Paper text:
In the synthetic isobutanol pathway, [name] is used to decarboxylate ketoisovalerate to form isobutyraldehyde, the penultimate step in the pathway. We previously designed a cell-free system for the production of the next-generation biofuel isobutanol. After the genome mining exercise, we were left with two enzymes, acetolactate synthase (AlsS) and α-ketoisovalerate decarboxylase ([name]) requiring stabilization. Many of the homologous decarboxylases that decarboxylate ketoisovalerate will also act on pyruvate, which would derail isobutanol production.
We therefore decided to improve the isobutanol tolerance of LlKivD. Prior directed evolution work had identified a thermostabilized variant of LlKivD called LLM3 which served as a starting point, although even the thermally stabilized variant was rapidly inactivated in isobutanol. While the structure of a fairly close homolog of LLM3 exists (88% sequence identity), we decided to determine the crystal structure of LLM3 so that we could have an accurate model for designed stabilization. LLM3 crystallized in space group P212121, with four molecules (two dimers) in the asymmetric unit. Based on the LLM3 crystal structure (chain A), we employed the PROSS algorithm, which suggested three variants, each bearing 21 to 32 designed mutations. We edited the designs to remove mutations we judged as possibly too near the active site. Two of the enzyme designs were inactive, but one bearing 20 mutations after editing was found to be active upon initial purification ([name]-P). We found three positions (K64, E95 and S244) that showed slower inactivation when restored to the wild-type side chain so we combined them together to generate a [name] enzyme with 17 mutations ([name]-P2). Although [name]-P2, like LLM3 was rapidly inactivated in 8% isobutanol, we observed greatly improved stability in 4% isobutanol, indicating that Kiv-P2 had better solvent tolerance than the LLM3 starting point. [name]-S had greatly improved solvent tolerance, retaining ~50% of its starting activity after 7 days at room temperature in 8% isobutanol.
Residue numbers in the entry:
A (entry chain BBB): 1 to 180, 186 to 548
B (entry chain AAA): 1 to 181, 188 to 342, 346 to 548
C-alpha cells in the first residue's frame, strides 16, 4: 500500500539520493520501515543528529542532493547547526522530522520532546532563517507540500525542512504523475557575456561554491577547456573547476594570493564571476581587488552587469548556455608554474613541509577534505590533480564538520579516494562517526593533525592560554576502541618527513582499507598563510 | 580596567556559579581571558557545544545556576538542543555568545559563522521560544541588560541568552553596588491550610519546578514536620527526601506500584507543587488526579479546585508552607533484600541490586532507555539526588550532565546509568572527565543497540542496531590509565555486586563499568510502557 512516506521517498530517489542519514526515534520508526524496505535506498544510521546533518551536507557536495531523518524537537534541534551550514554554503539537503500523530498535536498533549505547552510549531519556526522552504504535512496537503518544498530545493539548492507526523506518513497517496521576461533576459545576459569575452584582452573567470551547489563543475570545466579562458576560484568553492586545466591559475585569496596570480586577477580587463560570495576567510579578510565596473557576476539569487543589478534569470541554464558561446578563445598567456620535487629528510614534520608533501603526493581521482584550522589554510592553496574534488567550509566554518562530511562524500562517490585533514581539536567534536565508518567498510585516508590543541586560536589570541589546550587522546588507538580490526582500519603515528611520505604512499597504494594517520606537529607551528591570516582575524576582532 | 565582561562574571559569581563550560572561538577569546584571570571561577572547556549545554544543565540541577560560553552562529546553534532541554525542564542556565565587533556587525560584513547576508540577529531570534529572556549587549545598555536577563533567570529559573560582541565585552563598566533582587499568596495559603486541616487522606505531589528553585530541603522540612503522604513523578524525582517515612514512591499512572496507585487515586485532597503531567511521567496519561479535589501550584500559574489563579510568588509560597499550623497527618502510609547468584545479569535484578546497594549522599543519573525506566522507581537513601530528563528526553544528555553535576558537588558520589546507544551521542566528554580528575561511577548498559526503541517498534529492524564499540577500552583511548579510570566488564549478578561495592569503596578514581544485558531484556515497567508509547503513535 503506497503512502505519503513512499511519495516522499520516490521524490528523494528522483533527486538522485541513494542513502538517508540520521537517528531514529519513536516519532519516525514507522516511516523508517519504508526506507529499510526500499531496494533503491539505504538507511545509514549516525551516532548523533549533528553528525547526520554534517554527513548529509558532505553527501550533497558530491551527490548533488541529500536527506537525513531526525525525531521531533531533540533530533531536529541537535541538527540545526548542520542545516545552518548547508544554508550558508548553499547545499541541497532535505531534513525530514518525524513528529507526533496529528491527534496528539491537535490535543496539545504534554509529550516527550516538547516544552509541555501543547505547541508543536516552535521548532519549525526556529528553522525559518536556515531553510529555503519548510512544511508541516497533513494527509490533505502532503503531496503538494512535499513537491513545493523539494521544488524550492531544486530552484535554490538550499536546504528545506519536512515535518512528517506519524499518521500523515502512513496515510494513502498516489505516485507522482509529474516531474519536480526571463528567457529574453537570459539571452540579453548571454549576449553581453559573449561580447565582453570577445572584446577582452585579459579576461579572468572566477567560480565559487554556487557552481558546486548545482553540480555545474563539469560544465564550467568543459567551458574553460574549450575557450582556454584563465580561471581562478576562491577557497570558498575550491574545485568548482578542474584545477588540472592549463588555464587554472590557482586560489585567489586577496593579498594572501601567490603574487603572479594576484597581479593577473587584479589587472584583468574583464571579470566573469560565477556563483561567488566574497567572505573574510576567502578574501584575505577583505583585501581583494575585484573592480565591479569591469565585472559581470552571476549568482543564484541575483546578478550584476557592470555594477547594474539584474534579478530575472535562471542561474543553472545561464551557466549551461556558456557552452553555446561561439567565437570565444583566449589567445594570451597564463602565469608561471614552479612546482618543486618534495625530497624528504628525517626532519621533524613541520606545517609548510607537510603541505608541500601533500601537494606533491596527491593523485588523480581524489577528494581532499580540510578542516578549519592549520589544515584548511595549508591544504586550500594546493593544486589538485585531474578528476579531483575539494571539500572545505570557510563561510560557516563549523569545526568537526569535515569528519562526518568526508564520510558522507566518500559514501556518495566510492570511486574517489577521500583524503581528510582534520585537527585534533576538531576531531573531538564529531569522533563518534568512526563507528559508522567501520560498519560501512568505507576506505578514506584520515590524517589527524595532533598539535596538542587549537593552533589557529593560539595564532589569533592567547597562544599560552589554557583555553587553547584540549585533553590529549591517543588518536591512533581510537579505531580499536570503536571496534575496528587491522583488516578494516590501519593506524599510523608519523613524526618525520620520511615517515609522512612513506605512510601517505602506503595508504594511497591500499584502496581496500581505511587509514587513520596521527601526524605529530608542534603547537607553535602554523602554515605561512595562517601566520598572516591569524593577525588579520585579530585585527577584525580589535576591541 | 573593570569591563562589561567583568560585570557579567561578578553577576554570575553572585548566582553561585564557580565553573563556566563551553568552547572557545575567535569571537570570545578576549572575554575568556577574564574567566582565566578570576580566582573564584574556573574555565572547564568541552569537546563540543551540545555537550557544554548538557553539562551546564546538569551543573544547574545541583548548583541551582549555571553558565556556558559559545561562539556566534556555529557554537550557539550546536548548543540550542541543550538550551531547549533547560527550557523544557526549567533549569537556570545562562548561555553567553561571543559575537563579532559592533563595527563588523554594523557594516554587515560577510564574516565566518554567518549566512553572508550581513544579518547578525537571526540566531538570537531563533532562541526566542527556548529562553525566558535574551539580549544583544551594547556599551550603553550592557549593565542594565545583563541585570535584566539575569533577573529573568532569578524570577523564572529558565535559561537566558547574552550575545556579547568583542568590543562590548572590553568596554568600561563600574562594579555593581548591590547584588540582584500578596493577597493572592495569602488566599492560596489559607485554602491549602483549610484543605489539609479537613483531609482524611491528603497526598502531596512534588515535581521538577521544586528542583529548579532549590526548594528540595524546604519541601523535605514541610513533609518531615507534617508527616503528610508524599509522592513525586519521575519528572522531578528527588524533589523531596525519598528516605522520609511518608514518602510512598514514584507515581507513574497505571505503572505505579499497586499500593501507591491505590493510595494516591483514593486521596480526598491532592496538593501538587511544581508538577507537570507528561506522557513519560504519567504512564502515558493513565494517571487519575481528580482536579475537583486538587490545589496545584506552578511557577507560571495555579489551580484551586479547577479555578485558575495567576498573581503569586511560587518560591515564597512554597517557603510559607513551613508556617502552616494545625497540619499533622495521623493516618497510615503503605508497606515499603538482594542476594546475588552467578546467574547472568537481567534488567529486573540489576535495578533490585542498585536499590539495595545505593548509599546516602549519592546522585543517580539515568538516561532515557532501560536505565531511566529501571532506575526512576528506586527508593533513594538520605541526602541523595536523581537526575533524569523525561520531558525533553534527549539521549546522550546524561553523560555530560552527570559530569556537570559531579563538578557542582564533588562531595556527592555520582552514579550514571547510560545505554550504549545514548553514550555514542556524547562520548567525547570522557576527555574532560579525565582532565578534571573527577571520580563518577559510570555504568554503560551494553545491550547491543536501542532496546527501548525495539520495545516500541521494529525489534528486529536494522535501524535499532548500532556499531558495537569496545566500551571498556574507551578510557585508555581517551588518555586514562587505571590510576585515573578503572574499567570493568560485568556479566553476572555476583560480578555486578562486587564491582558496584568496589567502585563505591574507591572514591579517588572514576569507574567505567560495561554491563552486558540481552537486547531482548527490558525492565518490567518498560515492557508495559513500550506498547503504550506505540499506541500513542498509532497511525
Ligand atoms: C563548532 C565550532 N566551535 C568553535 C569554533 C571556533 N574555532 C575555530 S578553529 C578552532 C580550533 C581548531 O583546532 P584544531 O582542529 O586543533 O586545528 P589546528 O590546531 O590545526 O589549528 C576553534 C575552536 C568553530 N569554528 N566551530
Ligand atoms: C537526541 C535524541 N535522538 C533520538 C532519540 C530517540 N531515542 C529515544 S530512546 C533511544 C535509544 C536509547 O538506546 P540506549 O541508550 O541503548 O538505551 P537502552 O538500549 O538501554 O534502551 C532513542 C534512539 C532521543 N530521545 N534523543
Ligand atoms: Mg590542533
Ligand atoms: Mg542499548
Amino acid at each position: 500500500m503506497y503512502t505519503v512516506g513512499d511519495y516522499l521517498l520516490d521524490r528523494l530517489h528522483e533527486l538522485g539520493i541513494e542513502e538517508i542519514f540520521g537517528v531514529p526515534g519513536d516519532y519516525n520508526l514507522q516511516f523508517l520501515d519504508h526506507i529499510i524496505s526500499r531496494k533503491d535506498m539505504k538507511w545509514v544510521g549516525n551516532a548523533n543528529e549533528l553528525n547526520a546533518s554534517y554527513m548529509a551536507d558532505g553527501y550533497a557536495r558530491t551527490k548533488k542532493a541529500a536527506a537525513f531523518l531526525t525525531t521531533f524537537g531533540v533530533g531536529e534541534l541537535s541538527a540545526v547547526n548542520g542545516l545552518a551550514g548547508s544554508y550558508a554554503e548553499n547545499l541541497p539537503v532535505v531534513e525530514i522530522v518525524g513528529s507526533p500523530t496529528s491527534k496528539v498535536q491537535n490535543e496539545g498533549k504534554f509529550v516527550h520532546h516538547t516544552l509541555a505547552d501543547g505547541d508543536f510549531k516552535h521548532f519549525m519556526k526556529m528553522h525559518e532563517p536556515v531553510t529555503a522552504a519548510r512544511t508541516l504535512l497533513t494527509a490533505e496537503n502532503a503531496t503538494v507540500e512535499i513537491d513545493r518544498v523539494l521544488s524550492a530545493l531544486l530552484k535554490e539548492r538550499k536546504p528545506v525542512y519536512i515535518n512528517l507526523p506519524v499518521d500523515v506518513a502512513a496515510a494513502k497517496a498516489e505516485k507522482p504523475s509529474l516531474p519536480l521576461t526571463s528567457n529574453t533576459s537570459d539571452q540579453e545576459i548571454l549576449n553581453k557575456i559573449q561580447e565582453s569575452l570577445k572584446n577582452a584582452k585579459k579576461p579572468i573567470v572566477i567560480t565559487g561554491h554556487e557552481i558546486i551547489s548545482f553540480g555545474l563543475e563539469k560544465t564550467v570545466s568543459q567551458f574553460i577547456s574549450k575557450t582556454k579562458l584563465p580561471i581562478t576560484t576562491l577557497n570558498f568553492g575550491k574545485s568548482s573547476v578542474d584545477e588540472a586545466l592549463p588555464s587554472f591559475l590557482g586560489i585567489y585569496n586577496g593579498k594572501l594570493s601567490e603574487p603572479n596570480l594576484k597581479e593577473f586577477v587584479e589587472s584583468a580587463d574583464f571579470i566573469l564571476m560565477l556563483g561567488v560570495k566574497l567572505t573574510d576567510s576567502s578574501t584575505g579578510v577583505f583585501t581583494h581587488h575585484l573592480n565591479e565596473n569591469k565585472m559581470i557576476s552571476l549568482n543564484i539569487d541575483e546578478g550584476k552587469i557592470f555594477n547594474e543589478s539584474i534579478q530575472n534569470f535562471d542561474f543553472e541554464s545561464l551557466i549551461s548556455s556558456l557552452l553555446d558561446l561561439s567565437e570565444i578563445e583566449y589567445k594570451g598567456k597564463y602565469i608561471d608554474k614552479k612546482q618543486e620535487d618534495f625530497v624528504p629528510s628525517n626532519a621533524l614534520l613541520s606545517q609548510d613541509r607537510l603541505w608541500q608533501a601533500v601537494e606533491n603526493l596527491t593523485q588523480s581521482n581524489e577528494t581532499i577534505v580540510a578542516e578549519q584550522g592549520t589544515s584548511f589554510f595549508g591544504a586550500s592553496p594546493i593544486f589538485l590533480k585531474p578528476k579531483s574534488h575539494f571539500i572545505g567550509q570557510p563561510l560557516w566554518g563549523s569545526i568537526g564538520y569535515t569528519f562526518p562530511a568526508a564520510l558522507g562524500s566518500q559514501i556518495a562517490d566510492k570511486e574517489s579516494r577521500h583524503l581528510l585533514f582534520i585537527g585534533d581539536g576538531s576531531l573531538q567534536l564529531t569522533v563518534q562517526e568512526l563507528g559508522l565508518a567501520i560498519r560501512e567498510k568505507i576506505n578514506p585516508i584520515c590524517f589527524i593533525i595532533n598539535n596538542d590543541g587549537y593552533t589557529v586560536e593560539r595564532e589569533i589570541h592567547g597562544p599560552n592560554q589554557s583555553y587553547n589546550d584540549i585533553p590529549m587522546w591517543n588518536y591512533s588507538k581510537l579505531p580499536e576502541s570503536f571496534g575496528a580490526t587491522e583488516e578494516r582500519v590501519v593506524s599510523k603515528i608519523v613524526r618525520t618527513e620520511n615517515e609522512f611520505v612513506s605512510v601517505m604512499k602506503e595508504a594511497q597504494a591500499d584502496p581496500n582499507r581505511m587509514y587513520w594517520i596521527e601526524l605529530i606537529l608542534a603547537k607553535e607551528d602554523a602554515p605561512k598563510v595562517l601566520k598572516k591570516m591569524g593577525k588579520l582575524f585579530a585585527e577584525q576582532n580589535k576591541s
